[PDB]
Design an enzyme around this catalytic site. Structure first.
Site, PDB file in Angstrom:
ATOM      1  N   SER A 104       0.683  -1.416   0.006  1.00  0.00           N
ATOM      2  CA  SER A 104      -0.018   0.048   0.055  1.00  0.00           C
ATOM      3  C   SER A 104       0.798   1.399  -0.133  1.00  0.00           C
ATOM      4  CB  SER A 104      -1.083  -0.046   1.116  1.00  0.00           C
ATOM      5  OG  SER A 104      -1.957  -0.856   1.067  1.00  0.00           O
ATOM      6  N   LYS A 123       0.136   3.667  -2.755  1.00  0.00           N
ATOM      7  CA  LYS A 123      -0.827   4.494  -2.934  1.00  0.00           C
ATOM      8  C   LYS A 123      -0.629   6.037  -3.040  1.00  0.00           C
ATOM      9  CE  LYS A 123      -4.051   1.268  -1.024  1.00  0.00           C
ATOM     10  NZ  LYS A 123      -4.229   0.310   0.207  1.00  0.00           N
ATOM     11  N   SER A 145      -5.669   3.703   4.081  1.00  0.00           N
ATOM     12  CA  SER A 145      -5.342   2.554   3.252  1.00  0.00           C
ATOM     13  C   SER A 145      -6.373   1.694   2.492  1.00  0.00           C
ATOM     14  CB  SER A 145      -4.263   1.652   4.035  1.00  0.00           C
ATOM     15  OG  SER A 145      -3.302   1.173   2.977  1.00  0.00           O
ATOM     16  N   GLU A 176      -5.521  -3.493  -6.997  1.00  0.00           N
ATOM     17  CA  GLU A 176      -5.822  -4.172  -5.753  1.00  0.00           C
ATOM     18  C   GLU A 176      -6.795  -5.216  -5.823  1.00  0.00           C
ATOM     19  OE1 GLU A 176      -4.312  -3.573  -2.965  1.00  0.00           O
ATOM     20  OE2 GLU A 176      -3.583  -1.460  -3.033  1.00  0.00           O
ATOM     21  N   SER A 218       1.423  -3.125   3.694  1.00  0.00           N
ATOM     22  CA  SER A 218       1.629  -4.652   4.262  1.00  0.00           C
ATOM     23  C   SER A 218       1.169  -5.626   3.191  1.00  0.00           C
ATOM     24  CB  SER A 218       0.791  -4.842   5.576  1.00  0.00           C
ATOM     25  OG  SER A 218       1.189  -3.821   6.689  1.00  0.00           O
TER      26      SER A 218
HETATM   27  B1  LIG Z   1      -2.127  -1.673   1.946  1.00  0.00           B
HETATM   28  O1  LIG Z   1      -0.547  -2.497   2.473  1.00  0.00           O
HETATM   29  O2  LIG Z   1      -2.830  -1.228   3.142  1.00  0.00           O
HETATM   30  C1  LIG Z   1      -4.028  -1.853   3.333  1.00  0.00           C
HETATM   31  C2  LIG Z   1      -4.144  -1.955   5.134  1.00  0.00           C
HETATM   32  N1  LIG Z   1      -2.942  -2.824   5.535  1.00  0.00           N
HETATM   33  S1  LIG Z   1      -3.153  -3.548   7.044  1.00  0.00           S
HETATM   34  O3  LIG Z   1      -1.974  -4.402   7.233  1.00  0.00           O
HETATM   35  O4  LIG Z   1      -4.352  -4.320   6.933  1.00  0.00           O
HETATM   36  C3  LIG Z   1      -3.456  -2.445   8.450  1.00  0.00           C
HETATM   37  C4  LIG Z   1      -2.238  -1.928   9.068  1.00  0.00           C
HETATM   38  C5  LIG Z   1      -2.329  -0.872   9.780  1.00  0.00           C
HETATM   39  C6  LIG Z   1      -3.666  -0.175  10.088  1.00  0.00           C
HETATM   40  N2  LIG Z   1      -3.668   0.622  11.160  1.00  0.00           N
HETATM   41  O5  LIG Z   1      -4.704   1.447  11.209  1.00  0.00           O
HETATM   42  O6  LIG Z   1      -2.709   0.835  11.894  1.00  0.00           O
HETATM   43  C7  LIG Z   1      -4.772  -0.849   9.486  1.00  0.00           C
HETATM   44  C8  LIG Z   1      -4.543  -1.919   8.487  1.00  0.00           C
HETATM   45  C9  LIG Z   1      -3.935  -3.245   2.720  1.00  0.00           C
HETATM   46  C10 LIG Z   1      -4.919  -4.292   2.813  1.00  0.00           C
HETATM   47  C11 LIG Z   1      -4.831  -5.403   2.117  1.00  0.00           C
HETATM   48  C12 LIG Z   1      -3.771  -5.429   1.124  1.00  0.00           C
HETATM   49  C13 LIG Z   1      -2.919  -4.457   1.025  1.00  0.00           C
HETATM   50  C14 LIG Z   1      -3.175  -3.312   1.850  1.00  0.00           C
HETATM   51 CL   LIG Z   2      -0.403  -0.846   6.089  1.00  0.00          CL
END
Ligand SMILES: *[B@@-]1(O)O[C@H](CNS(=O)(=O)c2ccc([N+](=O)[O-])cc2)c2ccccc21
Ligand SMILES: [Cl-]
Ligand SMILES: [Cl-]
Ligand code: NA
Ligand code: NA
Ligand code: NA
Length: 262
Positions: A44, A47, A104, A140, A211
């Site tokens: 992410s 983005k 995100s 995505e 992530s």
């Molecule tokens: B992309 O990397 O971001 C989203 C969300 N990532 S997550 O690891 O689900 C996440 C981390 C931290 C927080 N927070 O509020 O601290 C919330 C969510 C995502 C989802 C799925 C795939 C790729 C991504």
């Molecule tokens: Cl993330």
């Protein structure tokens, strides 16, 4: 410092994964680099480039940010915290940009991608900025597979730090658009456990986390340390096991290592 390099190598060794770091200190135009020319799956953190491409487009198209985009059930993907609340209505491109950057949201990212013409258009925007490393290949959610050896949807720490400098502190975007990007990133809700966790509480951060598969755990940030010139920091981390858990503590540790002394 040789000491900072030793500490990053020791952190990587103990982490079990592969760590990429690039710090740019605008006080003296110096850099601290660790695997900074290797490729890492952005997840992410990509983005930022998609939102920036929409901001760039808006420089010639007033009211672009107010354009309405339909949200449908068929748009939902695997992480839709904002978009799920707007199914069967519309969101503006500004709202989608904020949702992608601050929550995100993956639907929001897909709408930004689609608006500008797809992943190859986001990539062409990076090229126009002078970033010849970034590549966005997929939409995505598949852009997050993060398979070792796979160059899809990757960049290097050096390239992303340099580009983030350009976007947030430099002249890639017009003044209104640059300020909007910075405001959005400063309002991020997802980064408290990552770079922010390795910095003093008083420092101000605008960041975008990522992530994905293989325990990939990333963060890219613009940092305003107390009474100091800003920093740009990219911390990318990925692991050998497909189902590895996230390691946001590794990013915090890397941030602490490279800012110790400032
Ligand atoms: B992309 O990397 O971001 C989203 C969300 N990532 S997550 O690891 O689900 C996440 C981390 C931290 C927080 N927070 O509020 O601290 C919330 C969510 C995502 C989802 C799925 C795939 C790729 C991504
Ligand atoms: Cl993330
Ligand atoms: Cl503190
Ligand atoms: Na990726
Ligand atoms: Na990049
Ligand atoms: Na952070």
């Amino acid at each position: 410092t040789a000491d900072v390099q030793q500490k990053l190598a020791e952190l990587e060794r103990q982490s079990g994964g592969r760590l990429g770091v690039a710090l740019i200190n605008t006080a003296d135009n110096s850099q601290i680099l660790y695997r900074a020319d290797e490729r890492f799956a952005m997840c992410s953190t990509s983005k930022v480039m998609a939102a920036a491409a929409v901001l760039k487009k808006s420089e010639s198209e007033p009211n672009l940010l107010n354009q309405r985009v339909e949200i449908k059930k068929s748009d939902l993907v695997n992480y839709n915290p904002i978009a799920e609340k707007h199914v069967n209505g519309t969101m503006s491109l500004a709202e989608l940009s904020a949702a992608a950057l601050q929550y995100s949201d993956n639907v929001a990212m897909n709408k930004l991608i689609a608006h500008v013409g797809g992943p190859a258009s986001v990539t062409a925007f990076a090229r126009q900025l002078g970033d010849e490393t970034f590549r966005l290949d997929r939409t995505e959610p598949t852009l997050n597979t993060a398979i070792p050896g796979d160059p899809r949807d990757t960049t290097s720490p050096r390239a992303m730090a340099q580009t983030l400098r350009n976007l947030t502190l430099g002249k890639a975007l017009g003044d209104s658009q640059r300020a909007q990007l910075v405001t959005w990133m400063k309002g991020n809700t997802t980064g408290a456990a990552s770079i922010q966790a390795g910095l003093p509480a008083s420092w101000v951060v605008g960041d975008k986390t990522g992530s994905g598969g293989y325990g990939t755990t990333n963060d890219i940030a613009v940092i305003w340390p107390k009474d100091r010139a800003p920093l740009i920091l990219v911390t990318y981390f990925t692991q050998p096991q497909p189902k590895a858990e996230s390691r946001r503590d590794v990013l915090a540790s890397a941030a602490k290592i490279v800012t110790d002394g400032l």
